[PDB]
């Protein structure tokens, strides 16, 4: 049921080094490392376990941009990167320069993606995020999404990837334009945690639940608590949003995953 | 799973008219109706569906104190009362003066309580909160608590009380002194919602999760979101804590129980 089997620390993947934001995008354009480095530091200090790295829309060679981003980050912080790209050569270039064990963001359940990314994860001992979708489109239902999760699991397994290395992303969509999905995504998270022993892990791109809604921060933290209750293991999220992290910390203590003390808000951040 | 079967509005039971607080207690001592009336109004305005009414520790006749509290409240607001007392004569006196359909807070799973309160609920067409405990003591486990819930259900049913009228309180304890319980209480809520069709309802005395902890408000709202995700139907809670109510509102929209609009924080309060 809802009593978690494990007590692994919730994995926070800082979202901020993503060329969808203008500051990163203009850092990349200028080849200016300072914003990248400042954000790397800031997210590390706030408790991030991994840093998401996304080139954003560029007409430059994504391979060189990813390499630069990964080396620039890891020059100033001792964290691993969650390499976030639609381009597999870009991911592979990042993996070759990366120090320590990375995370790949992401493969879809599309056979020819799975066929490309899972060998990569295996080759470079990276974790890998699988998204519950494919070209047929956005799955509707928890049943749909769970079918794709099983497929991901079966492929991961056939490549020899441990379940501890595989993070299924059940695809949260914004609650204003796609409200009904949010509760289907909670039920998917719950079902994913049943599909193997050890279980696959689960992750969300959290800030998607609120894109273009009012009070994003309230919506983000409310859903993060719901999803953690459902069995979520990781999120790509705004680790600079102290209310958010305070909510996750509080949820993690309430799920008896870390032993209470009065300074748990600080402790959770150190773990 | 976690996709709720219904879409009933979450039931908020204002906690504040309780002689554990000094102001109420001294209002009762003085027979001064103004604080009672102000708090009744304030909780109504904030969205309460029911108002909890608890005499607190008194050496006066609890029967007269309850009657006075219920009439004083219902003179100024059109809400029902959740009559909160260890004394069955006090509850019955309140029921006789009460306008509309009340709620009884509470019976335990102790046979001789059940034997007294369930007839009362049936006689006066009141809802009734059943607590998962008995004299053997504080149940440890979700399994323990669920056994007591089943017992409550079986007794309710033998008295002819509909499941829609029966709110099982799975007994949340403070996370600093009894951390492990909080996740057992979530799993109990989930199991209670399986025990009949229609299901019994569930309720928590929410503010118990944080008694004598720091930042009670953060702990209270975090657990309320977790419990709602698990299938909670009602809470006795601080409806004057706008952050709390904002969290519940947000959870209720994320559970697809009320259709999103941009002003849902206001709408949820009107429903």
């Amino acid at each position: 049921g809802l009593v978690p089997r494990g007590s692994h620390m919730f994995i926070m993947i800082g979202e901020r080094i993503n060329g969808m934001f203008k500051d990163i995008r203009e850092a990349i354009l200028n080849k200016d490392p300072r914003p990248i480095q400042e954000w790397a530091r800031r997210q590390a200090e706030k408790g991030a376990h991994y840093l998401d790295v996304n080139t954003g829309p560029t007409a430059d060679d994504p391979v060189r941009v990813m390499e630069w981003l990964v080396k620039t980050i890891q020059e100033v912080v001792d964290l691993p990167c969650c390499l976030d790209s639609t381009n597999p050569d870009a991911i592979e270039a990042g993996l070759k320069v990366h120090r320590g064990h990375a995370m790949i963001n992401s493969t879809s359940a599309d056979q020819w993606k799975m066929d490309i990314f899972f060998p990569m994860a295996k080759k470079y001992e990276a974790a890998i995020i699988g998204l519950t979708m494919n070209e047929k489109g956005v799955p509707k239902d928890a049943n749909d999404r769970s079918q794709l999760a099983m497929e991901l699991v079966a492929n991961a397994d056939a490549h020899g990837i441990p379940m501890t290395e595989l993070y299924i992303d059940p695809l949260i969509l914004p609650v204003n334009v796609a409200q009904e999905h949010a509760v289907e995504v909670l039920e998917t998270i719950r079902q994913i945690k049943l599909m193997a022993n050890p279980a696959p892990r689960t992750v969300l791109g959290l800030s998607n639940v609120s894109q273009k809604c009012p009070d994003r921060p309230l919506i983000n933290r409310t859903y993060l608590v719901m999803a953690m209750t459902a069995g979520l293991d990781a999120a790509i999220m705004d680790v600079d949003d102290d209310a958010l992290v305070d909510a996750a910390a509080t949820a993690h203590i309430l799920l008896n995953k870390e032993i209470y003390c009065d300074s748990y808000l600080k402790t959770f951040r150190q773990k």
Side-chain angles (χ1 to χ4, degrees), chain A:
Chain A
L2 291 172
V3 183
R5 259 325 225 166
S7 56
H8 302 294
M9 168 76 174
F10 184 71
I11 291 153
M12 304 191 275
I13 305 159
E15 66 189 6
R16 190 45 171 76
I17 300 165
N18 185 311
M20 297 293 187
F21 297 106
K22 179 174 279 192
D23 65 352
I24 304 297
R25 184 200 296 109
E26 296 191 341
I28 296 169
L29 273 163
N30 293 333
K31 207 178 156 171
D32 176 5
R34 288 187 316 277
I36 302 315
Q37 285 186 322
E38 283 175 338
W39 272 119
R41 287 197 284 264
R42 179 74 171 194
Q43 296 175 105
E45 274 156 29
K46 295 293 191 189
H49 303 292
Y50 294 83
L51 305 179
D52 199 56
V53 185
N54 188 322
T55 68
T58 178
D60 182 358
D61 167 29
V63 162
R64 314 222 81 223
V65 179
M66 183 70 75
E67 295 180 325
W68 178 75
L69 283 171
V70 171
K71 293 178 290 170
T72 296
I73 288 169
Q74 294 198 127
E75 277 183 22
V76 291
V77 302
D78 190 26
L79 296 178
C81 295
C82 174
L83 303 173
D84 187 348
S85 185
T86 46
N87 187 314
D89 293 333
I91 294 291
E92 185 163 13
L95 283 173
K96 290 183 183 163
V97 302
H98 179 261
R99 165 182 78 241
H101 288 276
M103 180 179 286
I104 302 166
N105 187 2
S106 62
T107 188
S108 69
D110 291 298
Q111 197 67 64
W112 68 84
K113 296 272 182 309
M114 283 188 302
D115 279 355
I116 288 143
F117 283 110
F118 277 129
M120 206 179 294
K122 180 65 154 173
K123 191 167 164 178
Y124 298 90
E125 298 189 329
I128 180 160
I129 299 176
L131 250 195
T132 63
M133 62 154 359
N134 65 23
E135 292 193 341
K136 292 194 150 192
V138 49
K140 293 127 88 92
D141 247 9
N143 272 16
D144 285 9
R145 281 168 160 98
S146 274
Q147 297 196 35
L148 293 181
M150 291 166 220
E151 184 166 23
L152 283 159
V153 167
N155 285 261
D157 184 69
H159 285 272
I161 289 141
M163 285 303 101
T164 41
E165 288 301 299
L166 173 58
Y167 292 71
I168 305 293
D169 178 348
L171 192 34
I172 191 61
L173 297 175
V175 62
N176 67 337
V177 300
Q179 173 171 20
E180 347 63 83
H181 291 251
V183 79
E184 308 291 323
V185 165
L186 297 170
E187 175 64 357
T188 310
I189 291 167
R190 184 190 79 61
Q191 289 188 26
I192 286 161
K193 293 314 286 188
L194 302 176
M195 300 183 169
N197 186 33
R201 283 62 185 120
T202 58
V203 62
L204 277 177
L206 176 68
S207 299
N208 262 270
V209 69
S210 62
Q211 273 287 184
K212 306 293 165 187
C213 303
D215 202 350
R216 297 189 68 189
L218 168 61
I219 294 170
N220 287 169
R221 64 183 172 277
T222 311
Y223 197 57
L224 180 54
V225 169
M226 296 173 78
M228 287 174 74
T229 305
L232 189 68
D233 301 290
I236 300 173
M237 63 191 271
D238 186 357
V239 296
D240 206 27
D241 180 345
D242 283 342
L244 177 61
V245 166
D246 277 7
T250 306
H252 193 67
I253 261 52
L254 289 158
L255 288 171
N256 205 36
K257 284 177 91 196
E258 177 84 344
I259 147 150
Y260 174 87
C261 68
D262 282 345
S263 70
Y264 73 96
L265 287 182
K266 183 165 127 150
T267 296
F268 168 91
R269 284 155 160 106
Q270 298 162 356
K271 266 37 187 104

